Amino acid sequence: AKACTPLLHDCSHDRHSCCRGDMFKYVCDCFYPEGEDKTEVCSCQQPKSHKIAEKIIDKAKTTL
């Protein structure tokens, strides 16, 4: 496998196979995509800071 395991990609092959960066790396996360009774899916997910939009006091008629 030449290409690595970026975000939104399964990393069951290796919890530490997910691609890497200069600032922050990708963390493997497992979830039950409607298959908690069948099997769990583990993909690469990125961190957060509980802040995706905290500046919209003013209006704007244009795609942000």
Residue with tokens 């290796």: 14
DSSP at 61: S
Q: 12: closest CA among 45, 42, 33?
A: 42
35-42: Cβ within 8 A, 24+ apart? 41/10, 41/12, 42/10, 42/11, 42/12, 42/15
CA angle 38, 41, 42 (to 5 degrees): 150
Residue with tokens 């691609």: 19
* One-character DSSP codes across 7-32: TTSB-TT-TT-B---SS---EEEEE-
